Symmetry: none
Subunit: 336 residues, 2 copies
Amino acid sequence: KTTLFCASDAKAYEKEVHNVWATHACVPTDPNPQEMVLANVTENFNMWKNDMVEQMHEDIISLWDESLKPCVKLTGGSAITQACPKVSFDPIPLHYCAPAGFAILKCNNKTFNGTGPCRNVSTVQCTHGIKPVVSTQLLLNGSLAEEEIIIRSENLTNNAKTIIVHLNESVNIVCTRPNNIRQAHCNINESKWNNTLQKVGEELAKHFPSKTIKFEPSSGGDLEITTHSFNCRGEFFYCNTSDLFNGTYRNGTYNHTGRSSNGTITLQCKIKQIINMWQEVGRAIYAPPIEGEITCNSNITGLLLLRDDTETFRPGGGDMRDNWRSELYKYKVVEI
Amino acid sequence: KTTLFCASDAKAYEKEVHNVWATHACVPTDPNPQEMVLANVTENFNMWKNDMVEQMHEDIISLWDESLKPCVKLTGGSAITQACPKVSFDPIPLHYCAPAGFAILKCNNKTFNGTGPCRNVSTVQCTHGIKPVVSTQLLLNGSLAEEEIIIRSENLTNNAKTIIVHLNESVNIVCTRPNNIRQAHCNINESKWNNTLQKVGEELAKHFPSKTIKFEPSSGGDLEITTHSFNCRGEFFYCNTSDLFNGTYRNGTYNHTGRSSNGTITLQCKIKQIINMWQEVGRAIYAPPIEGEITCNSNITGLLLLRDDTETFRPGGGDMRDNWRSELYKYKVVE
Ligand SMILES: CNCc1ccc2c(c1)[C@H](NC(=O)C(=O)Nc1ccc(Cl)c(F)c1)[C@@H](CNC(=N)N)C2
Ligand SMILES: CNCc1ccc2c(c1)[C@H](NC(=O)C(=O)Nc1ccc(Cl)c(F)c1)[C@@H](CNC(=N)N)C2
């Protein structure tokens, strides 16, 4: 336990809300941090029980609270109104650093699954640059696994626990609302996606021995988790993924059963004004979408899954603490 | 044409020289940016013939003249000496704005090459925030193409003319003189560089039917142009790029023949005191480098190339007006 502090390359002249936030909350990053490599030592990590995740969660909640002010905030029977101006929105990498008297241990084992023993260890003052990207089903613009795809879970035999898939090669996704003003769409190359779900398919095949491994859409619930929901330029995008998570892996080969056109999977997206908040239990209401072309070009670097003869996996999400876990898995706050 | 005026978020209690200059030379940026989108309006652009570049160049010359004072300045055979204190140096974004009666037309075509027809244009009072980064070969801390790498030249078939490559994704470069006090070095991830040079190689392959596209170092000349020269915290870095611009593109793929060690290209750099000035024809001598760790973490946002079966390309630069053109290419002053 300690109280971490943040570092970033935020610009004071930038009116983008992440830059404003980091300027009023963080410290100038050090242009050349140097890692103290600890060989010979073997310590244990648990990405699922990490306070760094809670601190970061708190910080991102405060950030959204001060940056994205909704027209309405409804909780129970009480509603709160205030000015909801359109803003400049684009996440910047956040570093989390330990104060004097504390250190940050970093796992260098490159196939480490987040829980248990890690042996190539090291000492850093601050973490790597982390973009606080809030999304569901798909993890966007994070860091890639440097070798094979990695499966992360608090308990894999417990189907109620969220599975994090760390990809080794990103899959580009391009969402856009062209110049219906709430109708948007995402484009994904079907080849990269087929390859990706092939690799993820076999990596899941290893953990679940002789099963037909299917990928199906989210069963139901709030649109935030039943769709790939995310924030693009201050606008809340909800993108249908029924043609994305639609496949079958069996006997060492994968088959995409989702619809595609000319080698491209297109997600039908909707920009919503009424959102179910991730910070707290309640609803937030924002202004109609801005004018012009609203496009986000992102990289899919991770998956969020939930497991149900056959093993079926569906896209998950909703708890952003897992989104922070996908990047904070290699770190651990330590005493000196 | 007119007499433009600058606007910035420059800050009067900052002793950083860009701020010191901008506070007394510029105007508070304006909380009210109002863009005027236009339908049915072609205007023709020529980034290579834009006076805004000349004005910018001139007051960047003024800025440097008042900020970075060399111990000696030799021009025309005449030597001028003065105090050469080490200062705080870090570029800030400058906006260029049109006075009363004038406006700045802005191209919105995301793939506009600087020259020729542009349709989707708006009207602004001031340009975007531009950091006056003086450099050769590599363009640092600039804007990225909103996507698709862009090739710029007033005539590509004219080998004598500087090519500006506008990148869509930045390539981080970390230069450092560690705590020989003139020996420095730069670090660049090789993967991002081979990626960049491959895509650039193919967008070059488009303009050049299909010859073998080679990347070779600068043939010769002053160190300022034969190396990636730039200023970091007041100190003049000259970094070798013989292992950066050295590779071959053939077969629709590129392979790097430049040398590397475990995924990291390291440029051998030298902090120099005697400098061939970019402001004018002459030389300036400064004081020895400051003590401590001298590090700059920059982003490569563009390239400056020169073209010689095979088309050979080499890093170029020297004329900083080209460094202003890569950012001012989309704007034009009108009445
Ligand atoms: C199986 N997991 C179910 C679960 C588990 C935990 C939580 C949720 C769902 C709820 N998450 C969210 O509403 C949420 O992320 N919205 C959201 C908003 C904007 C963007 Cl861009 C976005 F990508 C997502 C949240 C509770 N809130 C309410 N019940 N109203 C916390
Ligand atoms: C093919 N183009 C050749 C060309 C064309 C025009 C010009 C040059 C070269 C000369 N540029 C420079 O000396 C120059 O940029 N130095 C410089 C200083 C500091 C930093 Cl940080 C830096 F990155 C560069 C300059 C003439 N001056 C002298 N010959 N003394 C103008």
